[PDB]
Amino acid sequence: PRKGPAPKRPVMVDPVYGSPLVSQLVSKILLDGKKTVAQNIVYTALEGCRAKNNTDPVQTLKRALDNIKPSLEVKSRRVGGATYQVPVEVKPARQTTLAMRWLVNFSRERREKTMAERLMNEILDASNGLGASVKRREDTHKMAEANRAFAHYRW
Amino acid sequence: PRSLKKGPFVDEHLAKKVTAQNEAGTHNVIKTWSRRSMVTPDMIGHTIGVHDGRKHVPVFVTESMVGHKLGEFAPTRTFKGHVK
Amino acid sequence: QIVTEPFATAGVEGAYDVIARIGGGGVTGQAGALRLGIARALNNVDPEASRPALKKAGMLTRDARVKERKKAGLKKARKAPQYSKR
Amino acid sequence: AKTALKVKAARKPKFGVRAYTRCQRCGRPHSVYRKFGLCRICLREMAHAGQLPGVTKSSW
Amino acid sequence: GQKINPHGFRLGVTTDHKTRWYAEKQYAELVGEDVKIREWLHKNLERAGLSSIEIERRSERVTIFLYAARPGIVIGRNGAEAERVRGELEKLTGKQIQLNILEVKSPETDAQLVAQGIAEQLAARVAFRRAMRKAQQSAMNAGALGIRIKCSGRLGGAEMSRSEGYREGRVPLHTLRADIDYGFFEARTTFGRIGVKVWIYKGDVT
RNA sequence: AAACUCAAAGGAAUUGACGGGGCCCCGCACAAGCGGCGGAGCAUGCGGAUUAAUUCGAUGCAACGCGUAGAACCUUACCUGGGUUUGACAUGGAUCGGGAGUGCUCAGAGAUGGGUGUGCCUCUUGGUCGGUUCACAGGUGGUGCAUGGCUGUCGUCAGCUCGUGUCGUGAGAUGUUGGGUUAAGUCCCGCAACGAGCGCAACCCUUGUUCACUGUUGCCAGCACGUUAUGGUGGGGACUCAGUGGAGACCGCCGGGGUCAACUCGGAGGAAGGUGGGGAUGACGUCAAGUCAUCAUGCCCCUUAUGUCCAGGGCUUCACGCAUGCUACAAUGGCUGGUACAGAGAGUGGCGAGCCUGUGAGGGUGAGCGAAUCUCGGAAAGCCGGUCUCAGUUCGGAUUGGGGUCUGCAACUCGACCUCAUGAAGUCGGAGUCGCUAGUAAUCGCAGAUCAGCAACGCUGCGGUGAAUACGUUCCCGGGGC
């Protein structure tokens, strides 16, 4: 807004796994205002993760988030009579938000039956380095590199 | 539809006219505005001019009419189609 | 967690019984009210050794966030009917 | 409203179901409150002028 | 066009209701008789000048306070007019009416009588500017802290409608603790009718 | 040059508005986000078409789930037809009166008309009615561009002006420019200005903390029984709550910034901190904005009709177009069994428990409650168990056929609901477009107004669950100062 940066609500931690990441994940799933449904989905996905690999589900979620985190992304610019795609570096909070949003959206887009282990499959694939989320991260980075010539328009 | 335990609704003057017609010969057209009334077997074979808003259109009541209202056979709106 | 954590942030722990009578609201609102009640009980029991941490954790405070009332001409408290120019 | 309509509404109907309310000050047939008769406009203006006991503006 | 009635705005806060009775199964019919009483009194006692009609009820007994500038018309000769109006009131309602008529200490300060007088002058075809200035000057001679008069309509018998107004002093319409008396009347002329509104800031009240 | 033609052409300046002019600002205005609309079916309003009538009003934002907080009759203002004429209804003079007014019957679609029964209270002159008239009534007939009233709107926008002084021939200017600040023409500093007024703010309502007072129909910590059981009981002022009266927040304190000064940043205390959240409140005026149909009213028009009564019809039409919604397209879901947690409201022609009966809508009996007592009452989402397994489906519930219930004089046109069967489009929607900054959006149910019943999915409220995001002002829209 014009007035200034609005305050941010503090992020709570998940009672079970003790990480703000899982709370952010459930709040991102969180369709229709059904917190209990969303975190049932999230807990089921994390338990499926620890079932298929011995490593900790919170650690595998973290690894997936780092594999989906974008470093820079392009935004539209109205310089002159044509629009430009100016690449801009992404702050850690913004990139965590982008990673979570992409993870959730592509989990919803996956072909498997149930959301819980659609999200589980997507998390495992991202942690390994595969999947639609990682593909989108690579594509956005590729397009930022293609339009890298406009790094001097940053303000 | 009307409750069964309340019986059919015949407008209580259509009934008397059709009964008089039965007593004195089932040959006349009975003019009425009672679209409200229920067709009954006692009037079967009569001809009733049911009002439709502007004219008493005649209907010859047959065996199958009985389970219907008098006004079902006297359309009130004319459409004929849009354009021509 | 929201109702147990007053003890966790206090010196006492899960060796201290509690009896609660709860009315009104939904499950989450009842949880928050019970949490505030336990926090206030610990406060007025030991207002020197548990007061500082208990208040710093933002727990000796009642949030006035209540469902905003509906307003005429609007579908909800702030939702507005779909504007349709021409 | 029309005077004939007002008097017809006042008089007892032929069938009970055929009765209606009418604004007892105004004759208006729409938006008539059972609690105090009157109508939308009559209620608003009389409540503002203060002839209706207990009725005040609400701003909860 | 967009301003609230001052009396309704301050109702319950500073000013009080004109009717004081309680009834929860007859409420509508008591409202109807009250409307009949007020309409009858207004239609038949214009000459006296009615500031307010205040209605009370105890048990099938109605009490009417008539705040009038000149109760000479209401009382007639030795209370004959008072008795006749009371009798018409029983005829109209069917209940025991106890009627008492009260003065207004400062008719030049009560807004309703001020609107009464301004509308009467307009009907008698007095220049509206002169009438408004006279009323304003009289109000401030009495000692009101603020006057505001607005006459709207075919002022001066013209074709277009105007909304001519006068004011000086202070009239804080937005302040609830401000004691603002509001009056309105309609001058019935050969050219429709003129709406005259008067706000008078009596002072500040708790 | 002239004919001809115009009654102005023009100069400087003033105040506005506008600018694809600048500087400075603000608003869900973008951006960042979340969920939609535009596609489908249905509901609803409107345009158009149609019709005997489809009554009238509303028309960019600011008309279109709007007047309508309830159109089968009524409403009803429209149409066909049938009645009526001082009239359906008022007020006043006369004049003949004693019944008026009604019960039962007859004719009639009804209006109405004809029977039959019943028939004033005072008093010798009233209440009440009758005609004949006489005056007169009646009109939702016209003009919202003759008006009052009320309302929308720019716009919760930060402004709009005045007295006196001063400057200028004058319109006019100054104040009200400038610097800083604020949500704010909010304040501060300077200043030919010094002041004041309407707006801003505050006073009001509600919500968040707490104290005193009171203790039923509310509550149950300690005490005594209760059919086992129910604060059911005596009783209790503790807790909760109810509702009256107080306290509390003021940048008041601490520190920094700020020439200082207003302000600003941080901290402590505190339920709450910089306006704590929300409502009421809408300046001078604008749009000849809406309403002659709520009411009122100037003028004009109708007067065996444009009054008025009645039955039936219409306002519900349907090659279409738009708009606002609802249900969806499924697995964060459907079905099914069990099991938690609300608030705000309503009720005597009413809310109705319990029991019996029916597959059910319901019916029959029927307590209780004019209600902190009794009833509406079940909250739903959620949790837990089972099941369906991605299928145009055990998604969706349109349409259509059958059998019903209830309200009502009466559900054909044209009601809701139950049940049995039927099982349409719809695979997330083109260009375009909408709402929202927190207990908000999203969703989940509940209650009320009107109301016999109900086309209500509307409207106004109520609580339950409960987010994501805001780097920022470059761009789009609206506005503010110079």
Ligand SMILES: CON(C)Cc1ccc(O)c2c1C[C@H]1C[C@H]3[C@H](N(C)C)C(O)=C(C(N)=O)C(=O)[C@@]3(O)C(O)=C1C2=O
């Ligand atoms: C026609 O008669 N002559 C020529 C002038 C006229 C005369 C008398 C009137 O009484 C009106 C009018 C013009 C209309 C124009 C209307 C129109 N509207 C109906 C959409 C409109 O475009 C707007 C608007 N958007 O603002 C209006 O102003 C408006 O509503 C209005 O006020 C009007 C009137 O009533």
Ligand SMILES: [Mg+2]
């Ligand atoms: Mg009705």
Ligand SMILES: [Mg+2]
């Ligand atoms: Mg010039």
Ligand SMILES: [Mg+2]
């Ligand atoms: Mg956007």
Ligand SMILES: [Mg+2]
């Ligand atoms: Mg659609």
Ligand SMILES: [Mg+2]
């Ligand atoms: Mg229409």
Ligand SMILES: [Mg+2]
């Ligand atoms: Mg009209």
Ligand SMILES: [Mg+2]
């Ligand atoms: Mg609109």
Ligand SMILES: [Mg+2]
């Ligand atoms: Mg106008």
Ligand SMILES: [Mg+2]
């Ligand atoms: Mg118009």
Ligand SMILES: [Mg+2]
């Ligand atoms: Mg204010």
Ligand SMILES: [Mg+2]
């Ligand atoms: Mg107009």
Ligand SMILES: [Mg+2]
């Ligand atoms: Mg008229």
Ligand SMILES: [Mg+2]
């Ligand atoms: Mg309609």
Ligand SMILES: [Mg+2]
């Ligand atoms: Mg009650």
Ligand SMILES: [Mg+2]
């Ligand atoms: Mg906002």
